[PDB]
Design a protein around this ligand. Structure first.
Ligand SMILES: NC(=O)c1ccc[n+]([C@@H]2O[C@H](COP(=O)(O)O)[C@@H](O)[C@H]2O)c1
Ligand SMILES: NC(=O)c1ccc[n+]([C@@H]2O[C@H](COP(=O)(O)O)[C@@H](O)[C@H]2O)c1
Ligand SMILES: [Mg+2]
Ligand SMILES: [Mg+2]
Lengths: 247, 247
């Protein structure tokens, strides 16, 4: 139903306005990357290891907000086929502070590896072209660990370690950018993971804000991503914690 | 129109789900307060000054998300009269990491002052009661600078300085928690302020995420807060930056 598709995407509007328009969002991005630089400079690795930083791409280093804007304007639920066209459009922007941090790491005895669920086979060329244009250094193909068979990222982190790197910090907008332990899990388990790692945030796990999509959306309900549009609307509304209006 | 009121509040849903349910939101809160502790510990003040931290309350130290949930469920645009009832309901929660940071500052030769637009005359008793219950130390009345005549906060910061304090850092979810220079201004000017202070974020200006309301909402359009519901809906939608769907 077109009506349900409209309601689902209207529910994204305020979060999108905040990400696209607010100074507050930019300030959070700068805060994250300022903290990331401090952590990188402090990091020491085991003898014989090279220093790596793992960075997510979408909503961490690359800004895809115009795709979300297109969803709102056209009442379109997320579809990977539309996403591939967006990537091919080569209109990605950079998250504030990301290019400077990336280039600083790469010029100060580290290497940033991009562990991202952009698709290796169909989305790599647009990604590399956009990153070059946006000013990122170190965007040769071997820096990239784009999605092949698995969306969970831990196996790619392990590949990087096998190449003689010690990962000193991770940057992401999704908890699944830090490992697999809450991949596919509901939000209660995801909050618990965060509580169990409270001291790492702003140190070895660097967070960027994303109020539009991610593992937290799936985390709203069992089987969320397999529900129809009406079901997803209901899942979102049922997750709302509301004051009853009484004293 | 009830239909417009419904659409306006539906636009808050995803941002609210993210703030209420996600582990990612909690991680951002911990990141902010972890960075805040580092900044506080590093801070030095002028001879003869006492160390102060200025903290915002709403969506910085206190979590009012159930009020937003009530808005969604009842199709209610923001109204200060409903807000006062919410405050009186004494159901505020604490933002993750806030109580620990607050109490650490207060036990380590600093003082947190609460500079907040909760209303001094009608909202103070619920605020103090909730903060005591939530575990905050230092919530005697003299720690509070609640709103009296002006929503802009700089004059209250100056009052604190006049009492012999040097403010070593500010914590907030709204850029207006850092001074008056973009108070009442549109988002372009607010983003410019952030760019002009890029290095301060995560150091002396500590940001918490708020994808639900604030100065950035008013910043969407000239005279936004005086528009009717239809006008606010249009302002939000007109602010959206959308991909045109082409390559
Ligand atoms: N609304 C959504 O669910 C939504 C929006 C944008 C991208 N995506 C997908 O999530 C992936 C995230 O990639 P990263 O791992 O680089 O953040 C994208 O490549 C895309 O496949 C999903
Ligand atoms: N949707 C809205 O505009 C909205 C929501 C919650 C609180 N408020 C107001 O904004 C103020 C913010 O207070 P702080 O300065 O402690 O963040 C509240 O006390 C209230 O007056 C506005
Ligand atoms: Mg991402
Ligand atoms: Mg606030």
């Amino acid at each position: 139903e077109e009506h349900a598709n409209m309601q689902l995407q209207q529910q994204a509007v305020l979060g999108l306005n905040w990400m696209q328009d607010s100074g507050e969002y930019k300030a959070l991005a700068y805060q994250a990357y300022n903290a990331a630089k401090v952590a990188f400079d402090h990091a020491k690795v085991a003898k014989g290891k090279k220093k790596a930083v793992v960075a997510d791409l979408n909503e961490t280093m690359l800004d895809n907000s115009p795709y979300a804007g297109w969803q709102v304007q056209n009442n379109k639920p997320f579809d990977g086929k539309d996403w591939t066209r967006w990537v091919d459009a080569r209109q990605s922007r950079a998250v504030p502070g990301a290019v400077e941090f990336n280039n600083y790491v790469n010029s100060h005895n580290g290497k940033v590896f991009y562990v991202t669920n952009r698709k290796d086979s169909t989305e790599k060329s647009g990604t590399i072209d956009d990153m070059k244009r946006l000013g990122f250094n170190g965007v040769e193909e071997s820096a990239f660990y784009l999605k092949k068979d698995k969306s969970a990222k831990a196996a790619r982190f392990a590949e990087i370690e096998k190449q003689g790197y010690e990962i000193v910090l991770y940057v992401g907008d999704n908890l699944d950018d830090f490992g697999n332990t809450v991949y596919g899990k509901l939000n209660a388990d995801r909050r618990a993971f965060v509580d169990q790692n409270q001291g790492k945030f702003g140190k070895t796990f660097i967070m960027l804000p994303n109020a539009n999509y991610g593992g937290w959306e799936g985390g709203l309900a069992e089987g969320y991503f397999k529900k129809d549009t009406q079901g997803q609307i209901k899942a979102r509304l049922d997750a709302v914690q509301a004051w009853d209006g009484k004293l």
